[PDB]
Design a protein around this motif. Sequence first.
Motif, PDB file in Angstrom:
ATOM      1  N   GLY A 183      -1.921  13.835  -5.811  1.00  0.00           N
ATOM      2  CA  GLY A 183      -1.565  12.686  -5.000  1.00  0.00           C
ATOM      3  C   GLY A 183      -2.056  11.409  -5.646  1.00  0.00           C
ATOM      4  O   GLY A 183      -2.775  11.426  -6.649  1.00  0.00           O
ATOM      5  N   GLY A 184      -1.561  10.283  -5.134  1.00  0.00           N
ATOM      6  CA  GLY A 184      -2.135   9.026  -5.562  1.00  0.00           C
ATOM      7  C   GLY A 184      -1.929   7.989  -4.490  1.00  0.00           C
ATOM      8  O   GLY A 184      -1.000   8.086  -3.670  1.00  0.00           O
ATOM      9  N   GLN A 185      -2.801   6.986  -4.491  1.00  0.00           N
ATOM     10  CA  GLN A 185      -2.612   5.862  -3.577  1.00  0.00           C
ATOM     11  C   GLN A 185      -2.748   4.570  -4.371  1.00  0.00           C
ATOM     12  O   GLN A 185      -3.366   4.532  -5.427  1.00  0.00           O
ATOM     13  N   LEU A 186      -2.126   3.504  -3.856  1.00  0.00           N
ATOM     14  CA  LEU A 186      -2.129   2.222  -4.559  1.00  0.00           C
ATOM     15  C   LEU A 186      -2.169   1.127  -3.512  1.00  0.00           C
ATOM     16  O   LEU A 186      -1.490   1.244  -2.488  1.00  0.00           O
ATOM     17  N   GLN A 187      -2.931   0.050  -3.776  1.00  0.00           N
ATOM     18  CA  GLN A 187      -2.688  -1.200  -3.069  1.00  0.00           C
ATOM     19  C   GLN A 187      -2.421  -2.282  -4.090  1.00  0.00           C
ATOM     20  O   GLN A 187      -2.902  -2.202  -5.231  1.00  0.00           O
TER      21      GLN A 187
ATOM     22  N   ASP B 252       0.897  -1.174   0.000  1.00  0.00           N
ATOM     23  CA  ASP B 252       0.000   0.000   0.000  1.00  0.00           C
ATOM     24  C   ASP B 252       0.932   1.219   0.000  1.00  0.00           C
ATOM     25  O   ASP B 252       1.998   1.168   0.603  1.00  0.00           O
ATOM     26  N   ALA B 253       0.600   2.237  -0.783  1.00  0.00           N
ATOM     27  CA  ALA B 253       1.463   3.426  -0.796  1.00  0.00           C
ATOM     28  C   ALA B 253       0.606   4.650  -1.048  1.00  0.00           C
ATOM     29  O   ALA B 253      -0.457   4.572  -1.654  1.00  0.00           O
ATOM     30  N   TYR B 254       1.082   5.776  -0.538  1.00  0.00           N
ATOM     31  CA  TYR B 254       0.469   7.076  -0.810  1.00  0.00           C
ATOM     32  C   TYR B 254       1.594   8.048  -1.127  1.00  0.00           C
ATOM     33  O   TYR B 254       2.642   8.043  -0.471  1.00  0.00           O
ATOM     34  N   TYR B 255       1.381   8.859  -2.157  1.00  0.00           N
ATOM     35  CA  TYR B 255       2.336   9.870  -2.571  1.00  0.00           C
ATOM     36  C   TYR B 255       1.541  11.155  -2.810  1.00  0.00           C
ATOM     37  O   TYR B 255       0.462  11.133  -3.414  1.00  0.00           O
ATOM     38  N   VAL B 256       2.051  12.278  -2.278  1.00  0.00           N
ATOM     39  CA  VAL B 256       1.459  13.560  -2.669  1.00  0.00           C
ATOM     40  C   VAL B 256       2.556  14.627  -2.751  1.00  0.00           C
ATOM     41  O   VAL B 256       3.546  14.596  -2.016  1.00  0.00           O
ATOM     42  N   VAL B 257       2.343  15.587  -3.671  1.00  0.00           N
ATOM     43  CA  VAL B 257       3.067  16.866  -3.665  1.00  0.00           C
ATOM     44  C   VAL B 257       2.043  17.977  -3.498  1.00  0.00           C
ATOM     45  O   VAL B 257       0.981  17.927  -4.108  1.00  0.00           O
TER      46      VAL B 257
END
Length: 373
Positions: free
Chosen positions: A365-369, A227-232
């Motif tokens: 931003g984005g999130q992934l599992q 699981d990951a989350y990335y934002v700027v």
Amino acid sequence: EPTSSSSLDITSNCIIETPLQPSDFLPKSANLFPKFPERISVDSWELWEFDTFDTNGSVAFGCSLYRDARGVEQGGFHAEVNALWPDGTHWGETLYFAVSEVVENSDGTTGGKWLSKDGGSITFHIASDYTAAALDFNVPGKVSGTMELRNHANVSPTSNLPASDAEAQLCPGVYYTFPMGPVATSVTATFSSVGANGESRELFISSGYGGMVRGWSARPWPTFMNDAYYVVAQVGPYMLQILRTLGSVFVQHKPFAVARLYLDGSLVSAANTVVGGDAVRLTKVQPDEKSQGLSGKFRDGNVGYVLEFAKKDSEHGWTFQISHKRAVWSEPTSAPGPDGTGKSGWIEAISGGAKGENYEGHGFGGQLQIPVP
């Protein structure tokens, strides 16, 4: 005028099926030249990513350029291009390029080119001091145009670059860096076919926000995350950028993070650790807890996050409330079902700051599992 050059062609044998060690991390460098310069492994990946959004959180455009083996049977190296218009229409494609070339020039600039057999290409060009980057899109029938990112800080990008492997790492062997820091952005592009009508549209951003990522590893994603989350983001005077992963069984479910927080162009918090030399805490917000914010279309039902930057000498730190405002992409990462996973991109609405501050802004931003246990 190239002094270092790395050119990989899917069609040749540039991809080996056993592991390869990257070249060592270079302290106080942006490390923009490929760390797997002569060949990659089936495990290895490298990323050069450039994302943009407008100050009103109504337009986004991002491009992630990869070197990895994921796209080989689809004909090359993959670039992920995603765009959102103010009426909510979105355009997203994975584009494949047989050849990927990256050079470092005598003047210290770095150039990259993802190039297709048909002459189409995406290229990038980065200043020797990392204060400007430009991309050119020339993908016939898909997208053409330009993107630009520019840093105007009083402090140079170089003064903020990681000085050690640990400051450059998410976890051992996984490098994730933000070498440009705070940037102003612009986009001028034309898409051949957009929306359910398949008609042409243009997309413009000017004096927008965004950010650049440079990452690489010999370790494949499933072996350190599920699981990951990335934002700027820009929130008043704050600019922030963070990757947080939640571990798969292969790293005993440990969480990792790389995060940076700037105040009007100066670095105030650098964290490569989660709470548990600064640290971050990232907590999901559930829709039974907060009335604002979209959820994605998969098993992760969060409507946003609370992001905290903690310092050993700071009483309260900084806290930012992140709400999912507009959907950008949405793609499954497993067969459908009640535990079906996926990836979701967002324009975020974000507020907060230090104790007594309530700045407001936006993020991309984005999130992934992925279904790794």
